[PDB]
Write a protein that binds this ligand. Structure first.
Ligand SMILES: CCN1CCC2(CC1)C[C@@H]2C(=O)N[C@@H](CCCCCC(O)(O)CC)c1ncc(-c2cc3ccccc3nc2OC)[nH]1
Ligand SMILES: [Ca+2]
Ligand SMILES: [Ca+2]
Ligand SMILES: [Zn+2]
Length: 368
């Protein structure tokens, strides 16, 4: 039936700025919030302001030296940290910006707070659109990500859950999360992503885990132009098989919106309905679920996507006509919620999709 949804948001999140020209725009989190408020979706959710996660909470995964660096570095003292910036991959993709550490604290605080709420059985779903920063590593920033809020939230869920399933629908491979749990069977990581001449370069079909983690990492490599029809016919069968074999007791779903048609950095062709069908499929299993953000670089479409996915979490139907809102002009020329796919060629032939699905099913047969 209908579930209790807790949503985490800090009104300051939209003010963090990665710098002129940088595609990562935290303002998209504020556009999402404002749109979902104007649709009246606040009447049905418990809205919480995340605490600022401490350096200590972050060191449950990250190294002490890396977190000390993130808490110390600022644009005014950068010149004194040239050595550490190289060591921790702070540069063009992961710049130093005013309030960087506070941004990490809010992104992380929402994911960890959501995981605690799920552990206490005080909610069915917890949503943190400011989270999902899946590339961050133990001692290195990567791909616009500094602190891996996902890994920290999963470690929190592991306090009460024997098996946690992580699903990632961002266009980029979820490498930081896969690496963190690569040698354990207590987390199964499943990533659907563009593979081939594309960041971060990992996530081959043949990367299946190591040691006790062998068969607990699943990668579905895709080519440009995947559409709703194609994605939908592999997502539900793969997730249904993973559910059957792995029997997780909690799920974390990274909802990166850069897999939508028209994304500034992505090359896929999903609509908001096609992307949200993944949330519908996962929600159907009736397991404690943490829904997180991630990529998404055409910000009007990110706000549409995450607003519609919050309505899906709530089992609330919302009209296609957008309500007036603080960013109404960003949604022209149509002012509608749903988007149309482009005419781009889908390079993922139906035979390729079936063949990769079959190779993943062979690996899933290897689970106990
Ligand atoms: C130009 C910097 N250069 C660095 C070296 C490089 C090439 C790009 C090898 C690495 C790379 O390909 N990085 C990826 C990370 C992608 C991370 C996705 C994150 C998520 O999964 O969605 C989770 C949240 C990359 N692609 C696009 C950019 C990019 C960075 C910029 C920074 C400042 C200004 C403009 C910029 N414009 C950009 O695009 C137009 N970066
Ligand atoms: Ca992915
Ligand atoms: Ca694993
Ligand atoms: Zn991405």
């Amino acid at each position: 039936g209908k579930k209790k949804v807790c949503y985490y948001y800090d009104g300051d999140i939209g003010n963090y700025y990665y710098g002129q020209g940088h595609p990562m725009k935290p303002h998209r989190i504020r556009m999402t919030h404002n749109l979902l408020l104007n649709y009246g979706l606040y009447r049905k959710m418990e809205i919480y302001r995340p605490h600022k996660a401490t350096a200590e909470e972050m060191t449950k995964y990250h190294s002490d030296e890396y977190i000390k660096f993130l808490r110390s570095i600022r644009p005014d003292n950068m010149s004194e940290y040239s050595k550490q910036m190289q060591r921790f991959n702070v540069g063009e993709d992961c710049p130093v910006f005013d309030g960087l550490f506070e941004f990490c604290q809010l992104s992380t605080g929402g994911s960890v707070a959501g995981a605690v709420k799920l552990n206490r059985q005080q909610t069915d779903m917890a949503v943190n659109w400011a989270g999902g920063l899946h590339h961050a590593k133990k001692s290195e920033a990567s791909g616009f990500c500094y602190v891996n809020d996902i890994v920290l939230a999963i470690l929190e869920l592991l306090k009460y859950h024997q098996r946690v399933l992580y699903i990632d629908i961002d266009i980029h491979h979820g490498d930081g999360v896969e690496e963190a749990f690569y040698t354990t069977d207590r987390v199964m990581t499943v990533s659907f992503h563009k593979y081939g001449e594309y960041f971060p370069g990992t996530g081959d079909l043949r990367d299946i885990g190591a040691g006790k983690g062998k068969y607990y990492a699943v990668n579905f490599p895709m080519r440009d132009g995947i559409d709703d029809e194609s994605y939908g016919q592999i997502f539900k069968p793969i997730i249904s098989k993973v559910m059957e074999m792995y029997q997780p007791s909690a799920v974390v779903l990274q909802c990166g919106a850069d897999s939508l048609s028209g994304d500034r950095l992505g090359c896929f062709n999903l609509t908001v309905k096609g992307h949200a069908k993944c949330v519908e499929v996962v929600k159907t299993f009736n397991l404690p679920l943490l829904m997180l953000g991630g990529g998404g670089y055409t910000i009007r479409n990110v706000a549409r996507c995450w607003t519609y996915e919050t309505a899906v979490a709530l089992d609330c139907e919302i009209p296609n006509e957008l309500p007036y809102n603080d960013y109404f002009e960003y949604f022209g020329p149509d002012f509608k919620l749903h988007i149309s796919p482009s005419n781009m060629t889908n390079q993922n032939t139906p035979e390729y999709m079936e063949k990769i699905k079959q190779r993943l099913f062979e690996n899933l047969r290897m689970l106990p």
